């Protein structure tokens, strides 16, 4: 067939429109180049690009056949000779997630304006969750070299409008993520294990102050760890088992892990904490990899020391590279989730660094930040919808 | 905010509509529940579900503000109090790929009708390629227990209309594919190595007849392999190197592998052929796993025997399970591509069994069949578009 024709059907959705159009088209010489159809809120759009011999596109016969069929049932149709028209649209360059509880119109409006301001086209918008937060995705096409300006603008928008806003490369490679590590304390697990241990010794107050100082980046991590663990000197070592039994997962953790397993992820934890507490929990969640420091115990008593070497800021990033090497995963396809300045290097090395209810120091270097206390909002940044999670869990 | 309102904007696409609507909405008390937007062939649909206090949805103020803003620039808008309306649509249950060169309207019409006949809703249609074949995807929602009827119907449609039609589960787990194996002969590579070797001995005719008999399922594979390899008895062993240098990849093979690497796949080959030929080629393509039989050589001469055990029909399936075990991949997340009755068990064991220009015996048990001589059409069945492949290759 010689020449191209574009047929576009719009109106209120009704059963059978799709089959009726192509059945009609088949009476003429029609081969398909492209078909695009969606229904949004009972509004149907059906765009069909065809090629027919220049011995039928000329013709009123095709036009009359289509127009009568479509108009009679109450929809509209346009029919145009194209030839200057793309067959298939290009892929989006980036995707943008907007999360909030609530997402105001003012906030989403602020996002749309910053996007428009940079010459960025919105290729699509859809919802990805209604729970535990509202989530929206926009797939966009960013002009070459505007990506940094875009992230900057949206970070300002996120801070002023009280929504989480994440910009991600939407290219084939950098969205085939296959490996994730979680920081434990205040990320996978609620609270700080070291503070729970210090409480037994009656030093919770001092240890929490040092902890907060360290997690904000104000303190050297290694020195901070030495000072805090020293506070435990003389405790019976069963304090470890106690604290282990007291641990509560971050809300959404079980959903997060369970969903990441479905997707074939390798899952691990990297922690400055203590392996006698972490490894036990890790086994129960059936994780793949654990890096943790180590408490010194003499005669069933904590000495107040940690066994070197110390997992420090650089150490966490090293554990990730290690994990990815043993896993066969390129750094670009890795994810890291953390909350403290302790996690800064690890997030840096990751293909996707996610800051979860994080200190300002971590948010400043993270690829994305989550501000709501639901760990499963991580899944939304990984291209999963609430609907898919619920569906998967229904089939058991 | 108390009550729900649905706002729907339709018409010819123009810059700035998205930001304008939410900017207007922000003047009222508006929080977002869901946003859905697409443009197809310059037709815009923007559906927004909001909640505002029952102290503004009552009001003409919101309605007038929105209607004036939208209508003045030449689009339409409807505004309705909902409350009985879903926030977010459910995920599709399956996806359907239609491939052809050409895809006639009659063919696609036949697909749409069979789908409608089973009570299956078309949730979306899009193009996934314009080259080397036309490809279309339909995401669908299949009533519980109609899946088998659907596959049956579409197989009949595929056979009578000359298009490839594949139905796949669209659930989270069964679309996280991470491992693929290719049969070598007449799948990854053009022609049959055993026939190329037999040509040197002057027995190509007899060996091709046995080969075709075996690949149609008419012959026992092991016996067929013994008979054919015996034909090589007395050849100098450098025939192996000759044939190795003569091998040509299936069109699209390099694109296929290169794209599968981007997506973090583990890639391998399972073959009844000969490792001295295959392993060399496998190294050059940087594959992860090879299973192959073995030619017996005495004093630089082929004896006409293969070294046991023989990779047979069951053996190929076993090599896959093995590969997946060493890879940490569940069978449900594995893919197998083959052409002959020799591959039947391997395709069976795979989560996705793909028959590529295959004998009737293989097509009958395959999850999907490809009929065009382009190996990269495999990528379309794995949820990749032509656009994404071209984009990825542009960034190098
Ligand atoms: Mg932490
Ligand atoms: Mg073969």
UniProtKB/Swiss-Prot annotation, chains A, B:
This is Phosphoserine phosphatase. Signal peptide: none annotated. It comes from the Bacteria. Binds 1 Mg(2+) ion per subunit. Homodimer. The keyword Hydrolase applies. The gene is serB. NCBIfam families: HAD-SF-IB, serB. Catalyzes the dephosphorylation of phosphoserine (P-Ser). Keywords: Amino-acid biosynthesis, Hydrolase, Magnesium, Metal-binding, Serine biosynthesis. It is an enzyme of class 3 (hydrolase). One of its GO terms (molecular function) is magnesium ion binding. Substrate binds at residues 192, 228, 271-272, 316, 342.
């Amino acid at each position: 067939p010689k020449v191209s024709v574009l047929i576009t059907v719009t109106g209120v959705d009704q059963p059978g429109v799709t089959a009726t159009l192509f059945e009609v088209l088949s009476r003429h010489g029609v081969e398909l180049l492209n078909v695009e159809q969606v229904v949004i809120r009972h509004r149907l759009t059906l765009g069909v690009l065809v090629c027919c011999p220049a011995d039928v596109a000329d013709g009123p016969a095709l036009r009359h056949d289509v127009e009568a069929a479509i108009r009679k049932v109450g929809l509209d149709v346009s029919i145009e000779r194209s030839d200057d028209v793309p067959i298939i649209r290009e892929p989006s360059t980036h995707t943008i997630f907007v999360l909030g509880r609530p997402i105001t119109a003012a906030a989403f409006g602020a996002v749309a304006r910053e996007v428009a301001a940079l010459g960025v086209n919105i290729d699509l918008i859809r919802g990805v969750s209604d729970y535990p937060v509202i989530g929206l995705e926009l797939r966009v096409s960013v002009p070459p070299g505007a990506d940094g300006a875009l992230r900057t603008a949206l970070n300002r928008v996120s801070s002023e409008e009280h929504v989480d806003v994440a910009v991600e490369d939407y290219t084939l490679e950098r969205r085939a993520k296959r490996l994730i590590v979680f920081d434990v304390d205040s990320t996978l697990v609620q609270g700080e294990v070291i503070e729970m241990l210090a409480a037994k010794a009656g030093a919770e107050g001092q240890v929490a102050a040092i902890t907060d100082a360290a997690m904000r980046g104000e303190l050297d991590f290694a020195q901070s760890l030495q000072q805090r663990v020293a506070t435990l000197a003389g405790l019976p070592a069963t304090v470890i088992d106690e604290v282990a039994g007291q641990l509560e997962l971050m809300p959404g953790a079980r959903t997060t892990l369970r969903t990441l397993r479905r997707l074939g992820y390798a899952c691990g934890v990297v922690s400055g904490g203590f392996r006698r507490i972490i490894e036990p929990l890790a086994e129960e969640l059936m994780l793949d990899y654990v890096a943790a420091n180590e408490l010194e115990i003499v005669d069933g008593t904590l000495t107040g020391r940690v066994v070197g070497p110390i997992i420090d800021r650089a150490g966490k990033a090293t554990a990730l590279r290690e994990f990815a090497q043993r896993a066969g995963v390129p750094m670009a396809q890795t994810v890291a989730v953390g909350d403290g300045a302790n996690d800064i290097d690890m997030l840096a090395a990751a293909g996707l660094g996610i800051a979860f209810n994080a200190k300002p120091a971590l948010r400043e270097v993270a690829d994305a930040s989550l501000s709501h206390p639901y760990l499963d909002t991580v899944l939304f940044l990984l291209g999963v919808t609430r609907g898919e999670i619920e569906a998967a869990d229904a089939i058991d």
